[PDB]
């Protein structure tokens, strides 16, 4: 099971990560994934 | 196939989308298939934030001609011909790679990279939902996602090890 997550934070962090995540646009670990 | 040229400067407006779009980008070179499916829900989602401003219509009109161009390079592909086939491969893409950070997840080895499998396998969990499929189950699992995803972001920036 998951605790009780608040909806107004859990998108504050999220997006956050979006952006970190967007700034890079070539890692090689999605390619790692990707094809496997 | 080729590659269409870059969409002009994206407003604050969609940066829901902005990350959907970037994701489409990359897998336009691994896989057009996601790619298309992935413009799919950004033009969806962009008539469904807003629809006005000059500036929101023109790059709608933008958008929807890139997705037209798309689907004529392909020609037929049985993934864009046949939703059949084109869900269910977009079904074991997201189980694949779930199931590999799920895999890292108990192996007892944590990293960035894992966090961004979370994150991305919600973005594609996404893509799915656009077929107008999406059972309980899915929607259990992107609730995983997003919370082990923030979880271990929020707990590295505390500076803790993830459990």
Not at chain 1, 2 to 23: C, F, I, K, M, W
Not at chain 2, 110 to 125: D, P, R
Request: glycine share 4%; with cysteine; net charge negative.
């Amino acid at each position: 099971g998951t605790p009780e997550l608040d909806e107004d934070d859990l998108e504050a962090e999220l997006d956050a990560l979006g952006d970190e995540l967007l700034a890079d646009e070539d890692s090689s670990y999605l390619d790692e994934a990707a094809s496997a | 196939m080729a590659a269409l040229a870059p969409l002009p400067p994206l407003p604050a407006q969609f940066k829901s989308i902005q990350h959907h779009l970037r994701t489409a980008q990359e897998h336009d070179k691994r896989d057009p298939v996601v790619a298309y499916y992935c413009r799919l829900y950004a033009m969806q989602t962009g008539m469904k934030i807003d629809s006005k401003t000059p500036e929101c219509r023109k790059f709608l009109s933008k958008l929807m001609d890139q997705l037209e161009a798309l689907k004529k390079q392909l020609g037929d592909n049985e993934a864009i011909t046949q939703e059949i086939v084109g869900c269910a491969h977009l079904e074991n893409y997201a189980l694949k790679m779930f199931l590999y950070a799920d895999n890292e997840d108990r192996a007892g080895r944590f990293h960035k990279n894992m966090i961004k499998s979370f994150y991305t396998a919600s973005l594609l969990i996404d893509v799915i939902t656009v077929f107008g499929e999406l059972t309980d189950e899915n929607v259990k699992h992107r609730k995983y996602a997003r919370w082990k995803a923030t979880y271990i972001h929020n707990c590295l920036k505390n500076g803790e090890t993830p459990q």
